[model samples]
Target: YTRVVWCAVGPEEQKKCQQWSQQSGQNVTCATASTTDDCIVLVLKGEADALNLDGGYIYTAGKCGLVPVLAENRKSSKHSSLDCVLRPTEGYLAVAVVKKANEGLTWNSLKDKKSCHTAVDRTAGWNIPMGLIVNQTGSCAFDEFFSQSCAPGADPKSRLCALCAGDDQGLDKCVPNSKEKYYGYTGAFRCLAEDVGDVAFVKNDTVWENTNGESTADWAKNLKREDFRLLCLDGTRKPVTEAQSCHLAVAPNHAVVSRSDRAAHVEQVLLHQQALFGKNGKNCPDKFCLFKSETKNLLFNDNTECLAKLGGRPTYEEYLGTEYVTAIANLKKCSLEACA
Candidate 1:
């Protein structure tokens, strides 16, 4: 009876993990950490077994010897007859969002604009967009690409953190985690919504789920879908509905990561556990749903349909795709020295 220990980042995720622990009848357990990196530390030290991570995070964890166990397969925007678990992941659309009221702002006009990001090192927020900019401009000065930005996890005193509002108490500005009001997908989108940024680097689903009354949160409840637009790589603007062609990049789906030694066991346990609690699982709704969360995405994305198998057993480099890995390396190399 090999048990899996999951790491939960932040207090909210810890609460969610506790519920999952009880629901799993102790087959799965929890370890709490203050941040995602800290959670990776626990897994590296063998204090925890696995945790789902973003593409950029996958790079970090994978660099530290964690292997990908399962890739998150979200509901397809188009019709598909394949079972969610057997379906090949299509990845998510990374988009650049701006309020429609901000006319004359296209991808070409992005320089010196105030921007919002889902934190530094993230796919849509940092790597993809900045990589494109650095390549196009033939320069590695991306930190100056935006005059100001709410890029959480950046040095607190930089222009990158100038727009982050911190927590309600306003104590932990730009520290990352939920404490930074401008941290994740929703927070970055909110930065654009509240006019703190000229553009927000996030995924297409972020706009679809939080606007047009889809969200009941006070700041998002009144947001209409028509108020936003997406900037295409060709310097054109399109309504949010046109993201299929207007996005910056197609980011690899988030996935569960574990130490290479425990990969098989972690994969075995997760598949079994999700069969009991994943989307439309036999025990969901009435019992527990692994993909649903009360306070934003916890262990998995709310849109996850299943954690599907990768077509081939892939290394971190293969899983992230060659082009993306190259882009990330280029962007990071410059930033590493540029930040000096």
Candidate 2:
């Protein structure tokens, strides 16, 4: 059989996937997709075979007849399921956090404040928080609310990129650009630590890892959670760990998806290769097991120990549920043509 084309997304994952394919001997080959959405479409068209997908994109993938073949059970701490990725688990809580010293900043009065976001359409940074803001204010020009912002992938001319610190090479700041210098939950947290933004829209775990030294970065390695606080919807505040009652929205975990026709093939290839290269498999802790990406979630969630069966494919509606679907729909309504 021909080597299956692995539709790797993101630079790290793409590199790792190429390495894995070379090592897999014959089970897989590397293909490229600029983004998760592109990967989904590529798989649908048979240009690529599969890619690891964030749960946020599973809805659209399922709508296109792609099936979840494997799952990573890490979303928020609330839900766990080996049967499928769409288990109505409490998704990761998306929150707005500010320095505790910013006693004046709150949920209701964000106007003119500087802000940071992981990306323009991400669940925590963009979708969830913006959903609430647009729902309440009925406007799409969020730039008016934040005097300056770093939303990476946002319109380059918009305020969302005004305060972005740029990539290490000093490029692609603010607007939703890749290169991750100031993107994702961790990047948004760094934005706040650098004093480039008054508030960061991110996952609840951002503060915990950064402050406790789990993150190992210059900006957060020596940080303390006590320095920051979550902004509650009622215009109140709480410690970062107390997001259960103070979150803006919840986000699902990432998953590995393939076309229904190729689901079995992908799963078979993954299981075979992973048996040799999984985290604890014969090839690793000594080799570059496919799932482990040090800096970011490459093709798979780096924190994932293994890929378990989805057991059965879940429909888009069944996976996301009504609440999340509604949230996504609301975002589509408010986001500019350039957004989402």
Candidate 3:
């Protein structure tokens, strides 16, 4: 069978009634009242299984401040003026309290109410800092540049600048030498360009190769066309057909060639070529340029040109023709912002 329980007090005193039920029995329930009149109505309607009226309730009933008592299965004579009714078999149980009896009876009297409501109110607020909001907008651009720099030997910060300044060929030269220095010839920069297109021409710098007994033209004509084809096929140039139109124009001695494996090697030898001058034409601001300050510090000497002129050796610069194809491909895939 179902049971209904009711009691009354000021809202401030209501918690004491609830605590009593919890501490006294495992399965007892208690309800609070909003007014003394409500408490009396619950008792008269047989809705209250028990009543816990404060001293004020008894005194107001003209009972000389004597506490009311309950009789066995019946109403008590001390509170005979109040109606008595049997408990209901099934119905809602309610508690009532006198608001004037306690000054703390307004909603704020409950200790647990504020924390309960605040749990749902926390959110990503509108007042987010301006810097964080701005950073969110630029994150994509930063990510694109970061990805480009991740390419082998490609510094994402300087890559875009090198591309715009025509240092695409220089990239090929540096990657090979750097790879040879660090990772051996199996570096990713070695033949990555072959996936792109074909090589059209080759200019073998005379400084790189000397045919002591063979005629220059005869030796050049029979040179491995397959290697040249591979070189062009792999350069960063787009639309693959551009590879077929390329040529190998060799210079007599120090002049750059068009087809030889080290044709553009002269460009590295001639630092005055403008492309390799002034922070490699990256145009980074003074503050940002500090990142590569050591390289820049060395460039200050007037005789820096003398040091650069010694490029005929088999250094990174001398391997440009071999490295150009892959370097260019990587640069094309790089974002302009990375170099900037």
Off by over 4 Å in 2: 75-90, 173-178, 335-340
What's model 2's lDDT at 206? 64
Best by TM-score: 1
Q: Which regions of candidate 3 deviate over 4 angstroms?
A: 1-6, 26-28, 52-67, 70-340
Query: How well is each residue in 1-340 modelled by candidate 2, as lDDT tens digits?
Result: 5468988755656777778877777578888765666777788888898877655577667667777776665433434433222343335678899999888788877888889888776778877788788778888866587899888767777777877766677765553324657777777888898888899998776677578767666767778888899999988989987888988877765567887888788888787777788766888768667666553656765566566665335655555668887887767765411223
| TM-score of each prediction | 0.94, 0.85, 0.17
Ranking by lDDT: 1, 2, 3
Model 3 C-alpha lDDT per residue in residues 1-340, reported as the tens digit of each score: 1333534333433554454345334233555554443544444444543342211122222122111231111213343453322221111111111112123332222221110000000000000111122234443232232111112223424431121111234333222112111111111111111211011111221101212322243323333222221112122222222323421111111111111222233233223222222333333232222112221111111111111221233332332233332332332332311211
Please, what are the lDDT tens digits per residue for candidate 1 over residues 1-340?
5899999977778988999999999999999887788888889889999999889988888777788889999878554887887788899999999999999999999999999999888999888988999999989888788999998888889998999998889888987676678888888999999999999999999999898778888899999999999999988999999998899989999999999999999999999999999987889988999999842777888878899998789898889999888888888778511111
Each model's C-alpha lDDT? Answer: 0.88, 0.72, 0.23
Alpha-carbon lDDT of model 1? 0.88
Instruction: Report how far off residue 158 is in candidate 1 (Å).
Output: 1.0
Q: What TM-score does structure 1 among the candidates reach?
A: 0.94
